[PDB]
Write a protein that binds this ligand. Structure first.
Ligand SMILES: Nc1ncnc2[nH]cnc12
Ligand SMILES: Nc1ncnc2[nH]cnc12
Ligand SMILES: Nc1ncnc2[nH]cnc12
Lengths: 273, 273, 273
């Protein structure tokens, strides 16, 4: 693919808030434009070096939080990261909690999801003539999941070691009746808006993708229901711990994901017809 | 600031003997001239990469040990390192011991100091119109202190985990009556000449600064009093172990100091009037 | 020495199969031509960055396995690596086993060897007028040996922590009568063809050289004798584990070999007459 500047490559993708990028850490940073067949990624991708590992930072909402979950160009974002050569993708996300013990401030590394989105327009890169049906029974990359969990232990942070993420459409938050269904009927653990189709596309791109979620609220279940202001307040309060995990994890990603602990790394071998 | 070559940046500063720099380790080294408002730093600063971390080496005495402690341009040295963008500063220093159990050859990572210098001419960057009074109750950066101690453990070296450094003016060594005061009255543990005002300035520059001291002698207290030849002999005999600690520590400094374990990292927030 | 491109340097050499090099890991790779007084190394040396450590990859048999053990330009290979500035050399090798418990698939980090080659033409760089006789009582670099063993532990792989490598001339495999001598009379543990004079030369070049061997067969001792096809099949089946060890080890080699655990690092101090 064509990039400007030309010849830019990266090994680890980081998708999350723009505040995750730290210019006091990232060496030789460059803003890069990566052509995609889907138009513009959410913003410039910043490529630079962390402990000799080339990292590509992409704020999914854009800098300044300009793009709500439903309006994100998921195809452009994942195509651009794949085009740069990334093998690992760390997503960092805010989520609501549907269980007491997943408390605001806790990290969660989910292992499952339930897609309840409706309006994302494309849930795949493959519209024909090659039909592709990737197996997403175990949709996250286990190698990266365990690395995120390990970093949490090293740093003394609470990181819940499993969880089912119900992805809703939004942008409005759940009603109480919907939340009762997510919590009591589907038995989901956390709730967010951006996981799908981001993870679908990452899997189709044969990336090792895992999510580091930060609980920001209890959705409808506390005395006062979740608000946008509450979510953003808790995220900004905890972004420093998110960065510490991120910059602890990245230096250990110089190598490749272990294929037998990366469900999607060879997804296309048996997915295409 | 203006540098030659231009655009040089660094993340970790190393202040100590020129023998600490190892061209067999440091990748892409460049000698850099960093303008300061105080004139020349002690020598060229050599910037290069250690395990993907950009390090700036500055010999405080100059190459060849040309500059005694009292003649060092402390302001130029710290300004130049800060101007390059460093966040961490590892100082490596020779010190005398005032206690039997801090033996020649032992490393010491001090946590306190007593300033008994008199002739250093500037003890601060701030002469007005903004008055700055940094809190130096806990003057060293705890994050870096514990990292130096940890490396010592990994390598099997003795590293005393605390100590009070009495900084004297010199260049002449202490009389017996002075040493009795340092040891028995002030209850200092080690003695050197270069800590102040280097640490003051580093703190004002909002750097995470810690000292790795190497005991070279027992000042007046052994049968034969300390001499310059003795200090230099023990330092050169132990410089290889100093390097091993240095190159063990640096690769783990890709990230930022933890603010809550870095007393000076936000010193200016409440220090300026 | 003259290189094309000019000014290329490296810190760690990797000698083994071309399949060890992974373009998904190695940053900023460049093929480099390094002049030697002995003509062409086995192939281009690929220099690039792994976790900020500069690595030089050299396939001893050439890409495509074009050069049998007896035809390898050992002097050119080691001269070229030394000329680039490497301090560490990791050799990865296939070997036969002469003992039940060194099983196909197991790694072995040998500590000794017995040279039974005959036709390698030069066993040294030093033909006069400076006579050089390096001590090779303990011919491998202990620092690197223990690092290879440590990586094996971290990864959960079997790595035998000692072994005597009998190096035969080849290219034909041993007869049964020869194998009985290696196994029962010399009491060797593993057998290969490429160790000598590669290790001699590395030692004379004052490199920290260690071998990570992979058992591929039991030479004559199983029901069916070893064949070339069998060796290559087991190697290709296990190359991924070899890579995982290699890319686990390399990031920890930013520093220098420890002289007191590197028998050859100062070999020339007392070897030359
Ligand atoms: N309660 C919630 N519902 C949906 N998305 C969220 N993101 C953060 N909290 C959320
Ligand atoms: N005894 C001593 N007094 C002052 N500075 C020193 N540096 C090393 N040893 C010393
Ligand atoms: N049995 C064997 N003999 C010699 N070299 C070998 N390399 C691998 N297996 C071998």
């Amino acid at each position: 693919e064509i990039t400007r500047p030309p010849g830019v490559r990266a090994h680890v993708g980081v998708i999350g808030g723009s505040g995750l990028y730290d210019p006091g850490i990232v060496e030789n940073p460059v803003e890069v434009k990566v052509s995609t067949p889907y138009g513009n990624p959410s913003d410039f991708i910043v490529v630079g070096d962390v402990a000799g590992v080339k990292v590509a930072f992409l704020p999914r909402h854009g800098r300044g939080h300009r793009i709500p979950p439903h309006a994100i160009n998921y195809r452009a974002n994942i195509w651009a990261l794949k085009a740069l050569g990334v093998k690992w993708v760390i997503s960092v996300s805010a989520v609501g909690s549907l269980r007491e013990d997943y408390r605001p401030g806790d990290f969660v590394v989910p292992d499952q999801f339930i897609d309840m989105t409706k309006n994302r327009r494309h849930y795949t890169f493959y519209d024909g003539p090659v039909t592709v049906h990737v197996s997403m029974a175990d949709p996250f990359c286990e190698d990266l999941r365990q690395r995120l969990i390990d970093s949490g232990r090293r740093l003394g942070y609470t990181v819940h070691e499993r969880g089912t993420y119900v992805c809703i459409e939004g942008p409005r938050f759940s009603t109480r009746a919907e939340s009762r269904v997510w919590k009591d009927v589907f038995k989901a653990d956390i709730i967010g808006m951006t996981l799908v189709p981001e993870i679908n596309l990452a899997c189709e791109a044969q990336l090792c993708y895992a999510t580091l979620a930060m609980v920001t609220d209890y959705d409808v279940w506390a005395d006062r229901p979740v608000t946008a202001e509450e979510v953003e307040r808790v995220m900004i309060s905890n972004v420093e711990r998110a960065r510490r995990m991120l910059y602890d994890v990245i230096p250990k990603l110089a190598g490749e994901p272990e294929l037998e602990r990366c469900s999607c790394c060879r997804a296309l071998d048996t997915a295409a017809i």
